């Protein structure tokens, strides 16, 4: 062969990979968390957008904290050998480092740890993309005139 | 011969650390709206970090909150790209 360069992730595996969309709109009354009006628009937009990128999209709605962790555990143990990448989109309430299931919070580190290079060997070396629409606190940006 | 276990993650946060993130009940969230628009327009053209930078600009420039509550009115948002990737990422190939 001629000269080769290795600056780009290999993205021509047979499949682009999974796109898991977790769309938490309605929360258990006991949590005191408000419904997230407009999130279904987001979830549908993402489904179509990643469909056109050739991702195998799975939309999941209103998952408890236990369901979120089990879904991440199960998905990380699937066969990813034919997949280029992994995408997970989280739509929920949150604070810094935290995303909410319908009944309570999940540490973001808990979710992503399932895909660590040593714990998910069939994603080692492959890009793992987490897209997070959630609060990170309660500060407000007042902006500045241009 | 080894890679860090934290390598090859990308966290595309909707907002800066410590900040609220804004969602519109009719249009969807500012960040996801803008992310999908920029993916649709640039996924066959730009590397992913450059797409996400266009998302940063769209959210920063085109959105401003409207609220009857002075505390929450006229506010802005910047998303936050957190990259532990080790290569460029293009959604297209060949």
């Amino acid at each position: 062969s001629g000269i080769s360069l290795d600056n780009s992730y290999k993205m021509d595996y047979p499949e682009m990979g999974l796109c898991i969309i977790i769309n938490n709109k309605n929360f258990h009354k006991s949590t005191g968390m408000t419904s997230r009006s407009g999130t279904d628009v987001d979830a549908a937009n993402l489904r179509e957008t990643f469909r056109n990128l050739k991702y195998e999209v799975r939309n999941k709605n209103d998952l408890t904290r236990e369901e979120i962790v089990e879904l991440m555990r199960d998905v990380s143990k699937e066969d990813h050998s034919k997949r280029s990448s992994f995408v997970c989109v989280l739509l929920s309430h949150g604070e810094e480092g935290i995303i909410f299931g319908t009944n309570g919070p999940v540490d973001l580190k808990k979710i992503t740890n399932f895909f660590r290079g040593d714990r998910c060997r069939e994603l080692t070396g492959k890009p793992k993309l987490f897209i997070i629409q959630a609060c990170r606190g309660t500060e407000l940006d007042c902006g500045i005139e241009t | 011969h080894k890679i860090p276990v934290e390598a090859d993650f990308l966290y595309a946060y909707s907002t800066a650390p410590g900040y609220y993130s804004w969602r519109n009940s009719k249009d969807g969230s500012w960040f996801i709206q803008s992310l999908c628009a920029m993916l649709k327009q640039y996924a066959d053209k730009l590397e992913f970090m450059h797409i996400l930078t266009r998302v940063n600009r769209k959210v920063a420039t085109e959105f401003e909150s409207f609220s009857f509550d002075a505390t929450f009115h006229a506010k802005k948002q910047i998303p936050c790209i957190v990259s532990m990737l080790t290569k460029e990422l293009y959604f297209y190939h060949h």
């Binding site: 009006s37 629409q133 609060c135 | 909707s14 609220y20 519109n24 009940s25 909150s65 929450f72």
Partner: peptide, 4 residues
């Protein structure tokens, strides 16, 4: 407009 609402916060998350």
């Amino acid at each position: 407009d609402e916060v998350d």
